[PDB]
Amino acid sequence: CLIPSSELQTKLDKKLGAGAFGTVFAGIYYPKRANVKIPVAIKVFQTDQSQTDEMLEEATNMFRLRHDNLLKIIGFCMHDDGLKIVTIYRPLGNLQNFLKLHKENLGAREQVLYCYQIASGMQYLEKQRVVHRDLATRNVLVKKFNHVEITDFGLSKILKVAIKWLAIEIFSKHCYTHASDVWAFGVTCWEIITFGQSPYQGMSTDSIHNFLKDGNRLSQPPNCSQDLYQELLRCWMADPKSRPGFEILYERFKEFCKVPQLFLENSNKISESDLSAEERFQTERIREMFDGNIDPQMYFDQ
Ligand SMILES: Nc1ncnc2c1ncn2[C@@H]1O[C@H](COP(=O)(O)OP(=O)(O)NP(=O)(O)O)[C@@H](O)[C@H]1O
Ligand SMILES: [Mg+2]
Numbered sequence: 001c002l003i004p005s006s007e008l009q010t011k012l013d014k015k016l017g018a019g020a021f022g023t024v025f026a027g028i029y030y031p032k033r034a035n036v037k038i039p040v041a042i043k044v045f046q047t048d049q050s051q052t053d054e055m056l057e058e059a060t061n062m063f064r065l066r067h068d069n070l071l072k073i074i075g076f077c078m079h080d081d082g083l084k085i086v087t088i089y090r091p092l093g094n095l096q097n098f099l100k101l102h103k104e105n106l107g108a109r110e111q112v113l114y115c116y117q118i119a120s121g122m123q124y125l126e127k128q129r130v131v132h133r134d135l136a137t138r139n140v141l142v143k144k145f146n147h148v149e150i151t152d153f154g155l156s157k158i159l160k161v162a163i164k165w166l167a168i169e170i171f172s173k174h175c176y177t178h179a180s181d182v183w184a185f186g187v188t189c190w191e192i193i194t195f196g197q198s199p200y201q202g203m204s205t206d207s208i209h210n211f212l213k214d215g216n217r218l219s220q221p222p223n224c225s226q227d228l229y230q231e232l233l234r235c236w237m238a239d240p241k242s243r244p245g246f247e248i249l250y251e252r253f254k255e256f257c258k259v260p261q262l263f264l265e266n267s268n269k270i271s272e273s274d275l276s277a278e279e280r281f282q283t284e285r286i287r288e289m290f291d292g293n294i295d296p297q298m299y300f301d302q
Contacts, residue, residue: 001063003075003086007032010042010084014289020134020160021045026089026289029074038302039089039286039294040074043152046082047159054157055083062154065128069121071141071151083158087151088302091285092142092278099137099196105274106195108266109257114140114148115189116253121150122185123246126178130154133176135184136165137191145270145278163208164199169240171209179240185249186235187218193228193264194221212236228256228263 007030014026022045029038059076066072074086092098095114099106118140125132132139132153139152156176167183169175187199199218200208217236220229231252237243256263283296 001060001075003029003077005077006030008040008042008077008084008086010044011290016041019043020162027086028290028293029086037294037298038074039290039299040086041089043085043087044082045085045158049080049082051078051080051083058154058157059083062158065125065130065154067121067124068147069117069149070124070153071149089289089299090141090143090149091282091289091299092144095137095140095142095148096191096196098142099192103195105268105270106266107260107269108264109260110145110270111192111264111266112253112256112260113146114192116250116257117148118150118188119185119246119249119253122181123250125150125153126181126246131156131176131178132181132184134162134165135181135188136162137188137196140188145275163205167240168209168212168238171206177240178245179243182235182243182246182249185246186232189232189235190218190221193224223265225263225265 009028009030011026011028016024016026022043024041024043027040027042029040030036031038055078059078063073063076071087071090074088076086077084118135122132122135130153132150133156134152135150139150141149141151143149165184165187167180170180190199191197200211203211215238217233220226231249234242234244235249282299286294286296286299
C-alpha cells in the first residue's frame with residue numbers, strides 16, 4: 001500500500017534517466033515484515049505539495065492496476081516535497097534502447113510479441129477506463145526477451161517531444177481519449193518494426209501537424225508487410241471513432257503471433273546462447289547499480 005521512509009532507500013547518485021516530468025532513481029525496498037532487499041526504481045514527482053485527497057485517490061486506483069504486461073507498482077509515498085512512485089527495477093532498461101541494442105539479433109517473433117503484449121496491457125487499461133496519455137517504447141520496460149511491461153500509466157490527474165506519438169485531434173483541442181492511445185500504439189508498433197528509430201526523422205514540429213493534416217502518415221518500413229501496415233494505418237484514422245479499440249487490436253496481433261515471419265521479414269532468431277548471455281547481463285547490471293548490495297537471485301526469485 002503506502003511505503004514509509006523506514007522501508008525505502010533512494011539512491012540519489014544512481015539517476016536512471018531524465019523524464020518529461022520527474023526524475024527516476026535506483027533504490028532498494030525493505031519490506032518490514034520479511035531481511036530481503038528488493039531492487040526498485042523510484043520516480044520522484046514534486047508537484048506544488050499537492051498532497052490532497054485527490055492524489056491519494058489516484059494513487060490507490062493506480063496501485064490496483066495489475067497485469068503481466070504492466071509494470072508492477074510496489075508502492076507509493078506522498079511527501080511534502082512531492083510524490084514518489086516505487087516500481088520494480090528492470091536491469092534491461094526501456095524497449096527503445098533495447099531495440100537499438102539488439103537490432104541485429106532480435107527476431108520477427110520478438111517484434112510481433114512486443115506489439116501483442118503492449119496491446120494486451122493496453123486492453124486491460126482500456127477496460128479499467130484508464131487513458132495512458134504517453135504510450136511509447138520509452139515507457140515500455142523489458143523484463144526478458146519475451147516479456148515487456150508498460151509503465152508511467154495513470155498519471156492523468158496526478159500530472160513535449162511526445163508530439164511524434166500525438167494524434168491529430170490533440171493538436172486542436174486537449175481531449176486525451178482511448179482513441180488517442182490507439183494512435184500512440186500505432187506509432188509504438190512502428191518503433192518496434194523499425195527497431196527503434198525516431199518517427200518523422202526528416203521532419204520537425206510543428207510541420208508534423210500539417211503533415212498529418214494533409215493525410216500523410218509514416219511510411220511503411222522496408223521489412224513490414226502490407227497486412228501489418230494496414231493495422232498501423234487504421235490506428236491512424238482521421239476520425240477518432242473510426243479507429244479500432246484495443247479489444248480488436250489484441251485479437252489481431254495474437255493471430256499475427258501464430259506465424260510472425262509472415263508479417264515481418266527478419267532473418268534473425270534468438271539464440272539460446274543469447275538467453276544465457278542475457279541472464280549474465282542482468283546480474284551484472286544488478287551488481288553494478290547497487291554495488292553488490294543486491295543478490296541477483298533476489299530479483300530473479302521475485
Ligand atoms: N522500473 C524501472 N526499472 C528500470 N528502469 C526504469 C524504471 N522506470 C524507469 N526506468 C528508466 O528510467 C528512465 C526515466 O524515464 P522517465 O522519467 O519516465 O522519462 P522518459 O521515459 O524518458 N520520458 P517521460 O516520462 O515522458 O519524461 C527511463 O529512461 C527508463 O529507462
Ligand atoms: Mg517514462
